[PDB]
Enzyme design. Structure first.
Site, PDB file in Angstrom:
ATOM      1  N   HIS A   1      -2.736   7.646   7.394  1.00 27.80           N
ATOM      2  CA  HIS A   1      -3.259   6.539   6.496  1.00 27.80           C
ATOM      3  C   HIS A   1      -4.576   6.533   6.372  1.00 27.80           C
ATOM      4  O   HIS A   1      -5.412   6.188   5.409  1.00 27.80           O
ATOM      5  CB  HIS A   1      -2.382   5.319   7.004  1.00 27.80           C
TER       6      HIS A   1
ATOM      7  N   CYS B   1       0.838  -1.142  -0.136  1.00 27.88           N
ATOM      8  CA  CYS B   1      -0.137   0.050  -0.017  1.00 27.88           C
ATOM      9  C   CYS B   1       0.942   1.327  -0.004  1.00 27.88           C
ATOM     10  O   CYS B   1       0.282   2.153  -0.389  1.00 27.88           O
ATOM     11  CB  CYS B   1      -0.998  -0.262   1.273  1.00 27.88           C
TER      12      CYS B   1
ATOM     13  N   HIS C   1      -9.753   3.232  -1.031  1.00 33.26           N
ATOM     14  CA  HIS C   1      -8.598   3.051  -0.678  1.00 33.26           C
ATOM     15  C   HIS C   1      -7.741   2.198  -2.132  1.00 33.26           C
ATOM     16  O   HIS C   1      -8.137   1.059  -2.216  1.00 33.26           O
ATOM     17  CB  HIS C   1      -8.300   2.322   0.588  1.00 33.26           C
TER      18      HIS C   1
END
Lengths: 854, 16, 854
Positions: free
Chosen positions: C293, C161, C331
């Site tokens: 995040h 990620c 995301h």
């Protein structure tokens, strides 16, 4: 601003399970590419029949790396192999991996494919979540950082064929900038599905014959191969082993080309080579070898070799050697750089350049091959000297080049300490691994740096590697000893005996050790003013010296102090101390409440006061009676002296009570051991008057005393008086009470725990039989010296070796002078000597798990 | 094109 | 040692084709995640129905990027989108991409998946080789380096990620070290096969509701999204536009964790944050916003936010704003860093922080959210000042953090040159793109930096963008003009006329330009000693001044010299020069064989010698007869003077020959244009005596002459005498022969090529009708000034604008004072204004091209 060196190496290449097998196949000229149905059929879809493949793919030591067996089946095989070779590389460096557990070292892995990921996700009804964790491309670096506990950057990168050398270039820049102290570079390629080979065939890149005819007229493509390589990079100060020093490393890209994206451009490669050596400050005359990309294509080889001869062979006046490991091995795409680097470093270590295969006639489009400015290594020829260049070019246009300088450290000059015997300890998952390490240490018994790194890598906990072993090298007996160590912590206990254990030549054999000799000379300068020196009591001993009791006292205390000093530099800290008379005097130095000079002067003053006054000759007959029966069967004025065990009690008294129990020794089973030491009744009532002259002399040495610790168990003080004011400190009154009281060596022994390891500190272990029946049967008793042994240094080293087999970590490198920091080249490899528990087989995807157009 | 030069020469011979 | 800035930005995010659409959806509070069958079914395999997906996926301008249509169908869609947004980012920076064509700039792309590669290789019988070139993961960076011709490192990296921000961190280190001058950072994610979503569902990472409830009590996972983002990084000296300055950037890894590989560790993240700001030298009080995040998981959010409040909120005394763009967008896994960076930079540019969605109650395990030390942005609140932190953490354990300082350049102070009209040129693939650029320039007509970067990006060849346009802003007429430019090179020709074109107020309107005024004052100081100054002939003009011929001569030559100077600073170099009498005098300065002072003194001395001596008043009647018929119909002593065209010939002589052809002007169709200039017979036999006094004065100014070039075509010398000694240099005898010979303005015009662009250098273009019938019909004639025009500066700027529409590159930024190097913030975005030729549809893989367990 930091120098970067290559410290470790390991790999798995075709028909090359270990790095040595690789080297052998390379110099053997064997075609490591084969025509076998090891992954798919022989020639299906029109594919070439020949390819280079690994020997095995289903072996993994899952318990060591802490993966669940259900998670290990759904893992990428290339990640399992990378975990094992990554451990082997660190161990090859001579570095214990536990010394990098919190550091900022980075991981850079060059991958290009994940076929296991798409084979394990074909059925969305029977999926598992663990296939994401074990097969995602970032996890090839993240699992390594997770297991080895690395805090640095953890990157997986893909740059087509130059991917492995690009990772090395980035790891170089991290160490050079001071960001990272160490790094790990990896490269992995595994051939699983044939659709990728069909893609490469339709692109026109694969040879129909499956051969990399490098620099040859008949070159028409390359051959696909497999490989898992890892190297360890570090700064210069951390390196125990150096293969080479990276002088410079850099990269660029071709940019726009009129011919196409695939076509190579030698001009940009020539610019990269020239900019690198310029910025590095090295002349182009100083090169002697360059490992080319050498893929064997029709248009790539003249472009690369003409770029090399423009950048390098302009004003040179010497032939430049050129080679390519893809002719021996085939071409692993993202792992081609580290495989070539492995071949180069093996060639430098063995002194011979490995030849090329399949080279018969030069390519006519390369004019430097026809006039001698470039020379192809087709025969084994020796390494002369200079720098080696390694370049790998991806087909997308990424160009990377390395300049590295080999280390030329000669073997050291001979020294008198090199003839002494050494210790070698080993650890492993199986008995065969320990046997392999010990037999390879026996084969190279004169190589000091090799034995030092082997001793360094052996400090692993017993839960990780449950089999340990040792062997004493350079001695005359020899013999490896391998056993399974029980898990857990075991307490270490020190027992030092009393008098009656001296002989002719006390500790001479281990006077060759430097630290023991330094301790002996320190005790010597301490007793030097007192009209004494123990060096002639050591070297010039005859039978007129140790019958004296003063010399026996100092020659016991000095030897015990030297043994304790050797054990202290060994790294060992005792958990419990218990002594026996003069042993309890040396227990003060063992505990730290005494120093050298106070202990030696206390022993000498005990001997001096005893030899000053004179009392009726005494006896130390030993009888086979218990402690309670001895009080009721002695005459009055005769006291039991030593409570060694439940069946052995030493009596004390004059000659006529000694003659009294001669007759009772005939009666039943009674021992008649009447060993005396000078005919003096120690631990008796005859020295109640000896203490007041002695106490006066002592107050001048152990003035301002220090308190005793809880680990020291007193043997002259009964249990109920352990909290008193006399037994808290090791004062002068503590030492004079030792002479006038019986030694209680039984009640101290019952406080020793169940699984203790007992070390005997004595010039001769005459208390070994007493400690066997006196302690619990789950205890190990290790002697350190033996009376009238020809080489007592070998006996000491065997005791340290079996101390490793009990479970206590103890590094014998500290006993000897240290080895110089770079190891000389030609030191034998360590990564082929590591063996795993490979009794289980794990899942590998087959060719049927991939779409075939059905 | 680059890879289509084979088919190119094929058509050339077909015309020849 | 170099400062690194963010220069350009472009992106394609869910329901966000352009970066502005993104910002609007972000501040609009719209849920960019949708429940539509745009890639697979609604809820098959138990997947969540909601996901964030791009608007279109099948559009690509294949001809611009030079890919074959058969290769474009077998390309990864994410690479096509990355090529387009990569061009848009460079253009958003204000930098022409052709200025980076040979430089050492690098490319770093964060990818994580290649599903198009495995969809295009499922059938090994119908494979093509181009699917390897268009879908391999290294080609996502290598194709960018190939098209844009970049010579730096070209790396594709996967770090789960955090992959996009890791690429930004490496590009930062390349610019900071001085290795690279610029860099391109990319991030791409596209959802094509549902098997990956099933893997993430079985791992437990996906929310059942498909929502990132960031910092919320009800958070139970994240929502998968798509996105293609690119930014341009550069050193400070190359930046035309600055969004922010990167103060520091770094990375680490979690290492070993007892909880598992997946679980987050906030302690290592806190260490990374604290080490970064320390090494950067910034206080933690200076922060005002941190983009977390913020994935919305149950155990990740308290760990991250407690690490943030330990590293940052210790001694702060102010609330710290926190937000997460994943609550608005979802995301995207390897592109999450650059999407958050895009949201942060858009928020800084518009002055308002974009709010979070789906935040109702705080998580009770985060105590900093309950006492006010951390504040979630749930309403739009203004930007106050300070630094912004951006962190992205991969699930393998990779942690990356950025510190960036926003630029706060205010808009500039008003200046008198800001009221002058400006030029705006544009280029594009379609007429609609040119219309979009011109209308957006019209909307922001007072923004000088915006117009400067728009003029900078417009210099593209006509083969790449075949539609060009222009618009004059700040004037009163206005009106965009768009036309298609023919491909190829067109020669540029300079024609400057003679006398008879003066009027009242010559060039006043463009005296406001600084370089024209500097040229006028240079000519002024040159004629200053000669009892003359042309500044009062410019400003203080009445009808008593230009009826004199000396003032007319200097006020013609000075204006033509100033126009040539304006054209020379414009960047334009003529290919052919041809003049007309005093125009041919100014041709010396046009050719470079003369300078300012010699030209002005030569013109003034011609006027002075003419006004010194006196000859019978002359005439310049113009007749409708050819050159040959005029010689046979004039009386003796009357000579034809000017050969303008085949039908227009000027006669010269006294009043009675002038009165003679009045009657013949009545006969047939004969022009009776008798325009005179002071009643003097130039180009006649009456000035054969004028030359010897004039020649004497000239030898003192154009002493040591320079040779004429081949581009200058003489009009006072016949064709057969072009190689003679008189017509090679521009001497004093060359200029006096111009007065005594007829002007041959026809045979010079037939040497002009077919597609030439003709520029008229005159204070009034009275020769425009002559040049139309005298030249070939494939030529363009552009006037520069018009007599009695209210704003002649707008007329000049329209001529430069239609010079851009012909095909000649000419940047009007050089006319005005330059703009200061950092553009002020709030300057409008450029990357949403770029439109492509998207009339074709290309292949995209479907969900049926992936294995479903059949």
């Amino acid at each position: 601003m930091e120098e970067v060196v290559i410290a470790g190496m390991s790999g798995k290449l075709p028909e090359s399970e270990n790095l040595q097998e690789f080297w052998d196949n390379l110099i053997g000229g064997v075609d490591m590419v084969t025509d076998d149905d090891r992954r798919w059929k022989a020639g299906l879809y029109g594919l070439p029949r020949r390819s280079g493949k690994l020997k095995d793919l289903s072996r993994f030591d899952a318990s060591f790396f802490g993966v669940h067996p259900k998670q290990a089946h759904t893992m990428d095989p290339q990640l399992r192999l990378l975990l094992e070779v990554t451990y082997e590389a660190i161990v090859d460096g001579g570095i214990n991996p536990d010394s990098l557990r919190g550091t900022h070292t980075g991981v850079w892995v060059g991958v290009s494919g994940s076929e296991t990921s798409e084979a394990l996700s074909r059925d969305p009804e029977t999926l598992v979540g663990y296939s994401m964790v074990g097969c995602q491309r970032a996890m090839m670096a993240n699992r390594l950082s997770f297991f080895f506990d690395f805090r640095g950057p953890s990157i997986a990168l893909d740059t087509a064929c130059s991917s492995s050398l690009m990772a090395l270039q980035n790891a170089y820049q991290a160490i050079h900038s001071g960001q990272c102290p160490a790094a790990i570079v990896g490269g992995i390629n595994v051939l699983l599905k044939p659709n990728t080979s069909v893609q490469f065939l339709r692109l026109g890149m694969l040879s129909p014959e499956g051969t990399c005819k490098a620099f040859d007229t008949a070159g028409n493509g390359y051959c696909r191969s497999e490989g898992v390589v890892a190297v360890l990079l570090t700064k210069k100060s951390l390196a125990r082993r150096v293969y080479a020093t990276i002088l410079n490393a850099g990269t660029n890209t071709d940019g726009f080309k009129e011919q196409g994206v695939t076509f190579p451009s030698g001009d940009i490669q020539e610019q990269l080579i020239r900019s690198l050596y310029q910025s590095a400050g090295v002349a182009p005359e100083s090169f002697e070898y360059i490992e080319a990309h050498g893929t064997g294509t029709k248009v790539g080889d003249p472009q690369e070799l003409n770029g090399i001869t423009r950048a390098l062979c302009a004003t040179r006046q010497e032939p430049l050697l050129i080679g390519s490991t893809k002719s021996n091995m085939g071409h692993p795409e993202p792992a081609s750089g580290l495989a070539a680097l492995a071949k180069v470093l093996l060639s430098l270590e063995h002194g011979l350049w490995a030849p090329n295969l399949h080279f018969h006639s030069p390519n006519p489009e390369i004019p430097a091959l026809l006039d001698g400015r470039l020379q192809v290594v087709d025969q084994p020829l020796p390494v002369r000297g200079g720098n080696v260049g390694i370049n790998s070019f991806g087909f997308g246009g990424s160009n990377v080049h390395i300049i590295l300088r080999p280390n030329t450290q000669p073997p050291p000059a001979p020294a008198p300490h090199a003839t002494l015997p050494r210790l070698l300890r080993a650890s492993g998952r199986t008995p065969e691994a320990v046997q392999k390490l010990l037999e390879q240490g026996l084969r190279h018994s004169q190589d000091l740096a090799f034995l030092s790194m082997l001793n360094d890598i052996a400090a692993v906990p017993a839960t990780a590697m449950p089999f340990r072993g040792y062997a004493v090298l350079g001695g005359e007996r020899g013999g490896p000893e391998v056993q399974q160590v029980p898990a857990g912590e075991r307490p270490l206990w020190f027992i030092c005996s009393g008098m009656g254990t001296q002989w002719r030549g006390m500790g001479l054999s281990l006077m060759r050790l430097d630290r023991f000799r330094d301790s002996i000379l320190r005790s010597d300068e301490a007793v030097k003013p007192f009209g004494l020196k123990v060096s002639q009591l050591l070297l010039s001993t005859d039978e007129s010296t140790f019958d004296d009791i003063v010399h026996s006292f100092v020659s016991l205390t000095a030897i015990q102090i030297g043994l304790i000093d050797l054990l202290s530099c060994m790294g060992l800290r005792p958990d419990g101390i218990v002594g026996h008379s003069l042993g309890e005097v040396a227990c003060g130095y063992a505990d730290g409440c005494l120093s050298q000079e106070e202990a030696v002067l206390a022993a000498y003053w005990r001997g001096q006061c005893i030899k000053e006054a004179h009392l009726p000759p005494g006896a130390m007959a030993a009888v086979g009676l218990s402690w309670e029966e001895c009080k009721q069967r002695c005459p009055p004025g005769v006291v039991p002296a030593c409570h060694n065990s439940k069946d052995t009690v030493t009596i004390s008294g004059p000659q006529a009570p000694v003659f009294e129990f001669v007759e009772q020794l005939r009666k039943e089973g009674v021992f008649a051991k009447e060993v005396r030491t000078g005919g003096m009744a120690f631990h008796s009532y005859f020295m109640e008057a000896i203490a007041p002259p002695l106490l006066q002399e002592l107050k001048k040495v152990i003035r301002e005393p220090k308190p005793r610790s809880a680990r020291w168990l007193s043997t002259s003080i009964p249990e109920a008086q352990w909290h008193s004011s006399l037994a808290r400190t090791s004062s002068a009154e503590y030492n004079v009470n030792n002479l006038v009281s019986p030694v209680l060596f039984q009640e101290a022994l019952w406080h020793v725990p169940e699984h203790a390891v007992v070390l005997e500190i004595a010039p001769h272990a005459l208390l070994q039989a007493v400690l066997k029946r006196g302690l619990k049967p789950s205890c190990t008793i290790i002697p350190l010296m033996k009376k009238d042994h020809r080489d007592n240094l070998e006996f000491f080293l065997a005791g340290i070796g079996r101390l490793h087999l009990s479970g206590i970590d103890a590094n014998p490198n500290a006993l000897f002078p240290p080895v110089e920091f770079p190891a000389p080249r030609g030191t034998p490899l360590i990564s082929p000597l590591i063996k795993w528990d490979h009794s289980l087989a794990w899942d590998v995807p087959a060719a049927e798990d991939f779409p075939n157009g059905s | 094109d680059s890879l289509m030069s084979v088919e190119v020469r094929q058509t050339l011979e077909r015309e020849l």
